[PDB]
Amino acid sequence: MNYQPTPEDRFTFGLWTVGWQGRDPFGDATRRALDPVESVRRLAELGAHGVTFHDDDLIPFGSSDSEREEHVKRFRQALDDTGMKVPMATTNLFTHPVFKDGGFTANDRDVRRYALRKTIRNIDLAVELGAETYVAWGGREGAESGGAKDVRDALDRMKEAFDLLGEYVTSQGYDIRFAIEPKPNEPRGDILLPTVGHALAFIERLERPELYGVNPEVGHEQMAGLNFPHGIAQALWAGKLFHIDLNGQNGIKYDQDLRFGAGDLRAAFWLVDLLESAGYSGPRHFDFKPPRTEDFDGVWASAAGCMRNYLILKERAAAFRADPEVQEALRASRLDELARPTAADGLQALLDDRSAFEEFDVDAAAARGMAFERLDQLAMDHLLGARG
Amino acid sequence: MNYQPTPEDRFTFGLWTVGWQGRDPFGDATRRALDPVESVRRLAELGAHGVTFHDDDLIPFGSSDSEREEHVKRFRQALDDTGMKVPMATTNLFTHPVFKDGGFTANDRDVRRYALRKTIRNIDLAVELGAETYVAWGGREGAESGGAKDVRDALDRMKEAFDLLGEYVTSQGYDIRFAIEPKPNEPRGDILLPTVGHALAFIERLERPELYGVNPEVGHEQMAGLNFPHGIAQALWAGKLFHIDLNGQNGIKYDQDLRFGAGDLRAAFWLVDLLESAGYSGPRHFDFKPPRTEDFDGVWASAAGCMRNYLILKERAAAFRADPEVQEALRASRLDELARPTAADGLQALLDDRSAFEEFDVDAAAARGMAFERLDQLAMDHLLGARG
Amino acid sequence: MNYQPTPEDRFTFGLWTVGWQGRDPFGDATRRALDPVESVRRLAELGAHGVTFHDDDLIPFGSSDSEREEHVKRFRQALDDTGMKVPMATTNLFTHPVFKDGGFTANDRDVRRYALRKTIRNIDLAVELGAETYVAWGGREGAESGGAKDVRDALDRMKEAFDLLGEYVTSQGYDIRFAIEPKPNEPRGDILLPTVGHALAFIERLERPELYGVNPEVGHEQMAGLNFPHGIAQALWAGKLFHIDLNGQNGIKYDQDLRFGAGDLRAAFWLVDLLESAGYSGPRHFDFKPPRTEDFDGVWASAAGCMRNYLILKERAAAFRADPEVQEALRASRLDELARPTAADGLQALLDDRSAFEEFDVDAAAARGMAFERLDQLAMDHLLGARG
Amino acid sequence: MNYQPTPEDRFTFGLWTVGWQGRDPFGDATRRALDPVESVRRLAELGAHGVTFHDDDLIPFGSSDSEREEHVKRFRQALDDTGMKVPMATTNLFTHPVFKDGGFTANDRDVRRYALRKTIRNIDLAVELGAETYVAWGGREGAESGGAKDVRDALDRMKEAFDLLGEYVTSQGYDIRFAIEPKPNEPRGDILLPTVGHALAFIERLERPELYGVNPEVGHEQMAGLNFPHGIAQALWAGKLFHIDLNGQNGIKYDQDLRFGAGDLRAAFWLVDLLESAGYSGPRHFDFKPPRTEDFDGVWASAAGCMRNYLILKERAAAFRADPEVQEALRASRLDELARPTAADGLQALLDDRSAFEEFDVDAAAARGMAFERLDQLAMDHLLGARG
């Protein structure tokens, strides 16, 4: 009945989230800029565990090494005053016009080198602040037209970049891992490594794959019409879910970044069920944008809503799994059999087993119902708190 | 000017393509069944190189071992009479009601064992006929609801299956490779390994990854709104493009399987440019369905259209790349620089290079246009045969 | 707490829904055919109010006028034995191969005439059984290619058909109205009158527009990525919501026809809120397909789930609107002002009002938050039954 | 062979198109602002016929009545110096924060009144410059959440606004018509009047429907996955195609506004075929954004590409229709029969015609192929200039 978050819930927010001024492609900003120090204080009051940032959110682009120090010092003091942590950091390789054709995969070699130096500088900072994960979102890596980018060469350049970052952290002895965040499109017509799948496949080709994982975002996979919980299960299956971005999205369209719980509510339920069941111990990070219709009171209400919805769904998912009636239903649908090996007896035994083919009653098997609809209605009842 | 295909073009068709009777979810069949022998003869006349099949296309389900032999014998004779080859074969693990919850990942263990035996039997046959690739399309592996399938267990079962198939071919000493064909949805609400990316990532977790690749289909990636040519470049980058399914699709909706060239015409152009530029030497396989509005004359016209469109696009792509004006444009857009390493000089040199950060003129770089629009218009002109 | 439906709730089902055998484009049927008489009995037991049918569901295609009479007689007796009504009926102008290019808009004139006679015959029957609404779903009206159909001529033929049906009912003195059911695609590449909007616009061009309305389906509008509740509000605004098809759909893909409540749960909540708030008094019709994974027990569980979910959402929507805290929030967001005329004072007064332009403080207005996020979280809390 | 545009081709561009600075949701501007006078001169040199504008493109927001006069005077002089016309004008009711919840349908009544006065002021200006059409794009009319907007009240407010604008022009005796431009989403989660269909239906409920039409945009209908040429045929069928926005879009995602010809090339071909065949005599307006990767040379190359592609497609469509082989194919596919009335003989005759039902050979009709694939391949050949 009580859905009050406490820092023990590991909820985190990006400075760019509650700090979003509301400037969209068709309109100017509707809110004033927030001082990173105020965001830290306001989020701490709401029960958040920490914050995340892009280099450019904390240190305005072009800042002298002294102004830079002053910005970090004020930020650090706010963290000390509140107990807030910084578990993840990332680089802004998308806002400045210089990155119009990308950062790591820009056609211009000099921009690629600049992108790398800018990243490395923020990695040093992230370690200084205690971040355990460094996210990379290649928002500008891609194209609007087919001849503009040779994807094989671009993937060579992307691997080159990530390999160099790996060589850097290992040489400095840092205890930080990287997490690639996929997105299918926007702002580029098509973005490289468009889904969790493409990102996982790419990681396996890096020199030190153990240092890289994924940072999936609910809305991004949904922009490709994919099943987010399924994508997350694959990332977990591969041991690559290093971090996660939670939010809401209403289908295939522009990247909405609605507060978590909004958008596909059922997918949110199945996601929380999976994260909790699987024992994900990383931060529950929210990458959302409070709609530009809101004033500051609306911004904090939206942020609070993110955490509240996660806590309600966590409760409902737990009750669902703990329900003896649901446990019986899971057996009726043979989820227990799915978890048993198909052929622990081995290939030869399978080939010699006449019960697996020659004498297999295909019609009898086909007549068995899976009982998935009853199971799904039990899930619905639990979600809506309508059990009886 | 002449777009007549010859077996040297490596164009192949599935028996199920020209043989599609036109039965869709809302209507009965509009054409009679085709004898596999007639399809072989008709395709040979059109200039095709070979055919492909599912076990069930060639041998009706439930056939006794003798009827089975008779079906294979007639088929083999048609191949001998025409010179047609069979470069790929696959299993039907989706039509029969027994596979309603999947084949390799069905919740019922006995169905999983049956699915494996059915596959193995067709692998023996495929080798006998000279197939070099065995495709696996898990059309029934997935779910309509969240609790029906634990994806981690399902991926364990999927790997188990593929690993056993790998152990089988290697023990028999067969020279055949597997190719997984992704699809995001339909007939299941969500299908496991939904895109080329997910398939490539999964392959890296198999015991003998060298035996597995992908069999991407134009329409399937487009059902997720993805860029097909980009997906193919990634598969090539990883050395996993073992086979390919060509067809057309008009955006995000049901799987249309239009003839190749139909659907996204520009994507077709960029795909052919890539396959030819990259030196793909596998079959140019068409997985299409002649619309149910057509009679048999329309079926052959549609099949012929597939090959014709590929030949026209191949011509246009070649002229595009061979155009000195296009070659100049590619340099103007720095495609040549994208192909050069970002830092062959190494990490330390990059860190010591002040021209990469401290003295990098970010504004000067940002002011450079990429000239992508002129390049894309040259591509358009070539596609439409409007150069001057 | 009790969500038991009673015939007073006006829940209806098509014979083709619970009767769906499970044959999809990639698989054979998984269930046996249901006798329309058994479906009537089983649905009555579940608390349904009535059933609907296509001519071909009740009378097998090709039936002699005597077999036809026998089928109707048995059906009528089942209705008499249960108290079940038949509020709507429709024609099957999509299954038979003759309708491969459409019914009312087929290119062949003789097929168009046949389609009309087949419809008229079922209208007589529908009136005999007491149906108040006759639905028309032009599933085959459309095309896969651009030259196959001249849409202006097709719209002339569509209007011609509907006008003739209007002339028929009015001449016979029938008290029945028509309801056009839109769908963007499937089974045709593109279907004519693809959304509720296109259907409403078309109706205004018929000779007797008062006889025609729409029969929107949740899943169909969602196949175009549209907001269903918004579409329904427009139909109500125009006085054209004659009937409605309830079900679930998971985004942009093939037509799923999931049980109501499944798919977009929040959209389901807003839909029920609207239908109840607006006083829609027509039947709550379900056009769904129990997944082919289910046996007969699963079919009835799925049907029951449709009605249950509607009753739960109706409860939650009512509590939401009745909540004084929500009523205050609605005022905070100026929903009350949206309901007031913009200029009841008239054009001249508006032009003379300096407070509307010359002295309008644009900055002060812009600084007002809309408070939509707090309002939406209250809606979420009510939906999940988490109020406190 | 020559695709040089001349003002006689009626090609027009919005000032906001070539003037787009490149600021997207994730990045700052990449180009400097263009003086409307320079755009007029540059477009005139390219062969354009005229330009269009939003009040705010020409007169910066907040301008005093004197600065306003100076901006108009300079603009008028550029038009006089070049011969360029201004056939259409529109209002910017989306950029300023005051319109965050809409213009005509904002919840705040005072904003609705302000939106009306701002529009009326620009209507006077548009008439002064000779515009024949006034476009209305309600980009901010809509919502991100369900309770924020009561759509029925919003439609009442939308009609109220348009009715008042109608009363205004008719009282002033202006010879100008309105054209509503639909868009399904972006920047709002869901936009009111989301497709051409919804807009046409709404128009029929206005007091003076004859004054209103539609201004469809290629990319917008495609953001809903709809067939643009079909939508245009319906608008023409209703006599409501007052104006049109041409551009390119790659499927369902954010609004790309690519140059015309880009995106769905085949749809572009069918669109031009329709506009030319139907005798559309309005301006061929381009609403596109030269990608932010381009410098000014790229901007003019992109603009020129728009007109070039239209001219090439116009040529190909004309050759297609003029081809005797295509004319024969159209007859083979019974396009000629589609154009003949279904029942000019009347209802009674149809009911008495036994050849329409009792003696109709349904099997013989069903066996006829439609020959659509051959027809579509002829269309493809013409498009690619590969006829032989």
Ligand SMILES: O[C@@H]1[C@@H](O)[C@@H](O)OC[C@@H]1O
């Ligand atoms: O998706 C967001 C992206 O927009 C940027 O903010 O950097 C990474 C985040 O996850």
Ligand SMILES: O[C@@H]1[C@@H](O)[C@@H](O)OC[C@@H]1O
């Ligand atoms: O996608 C098709 C699938 O429908 C089936 O035919 O087996 C594999 C093919 O590639």
Ligand SMILES: O[C@@H]1[C@@H](O)[C@@H](O)OC[C@@H]1O
């Ligand atoms: O959408 C369904 C359609 O599939 C058919 O059954 O007739 C009308 C219904 O509403």
Ligand SMILES: O[C@@H]1[C@@H](O)[C@@H](O)OC[C@@H]1O
């Ligand atoms: O779609 C564009 C819109 O973005 C704005 O510019 O006003 C109307 C135009 O058509």
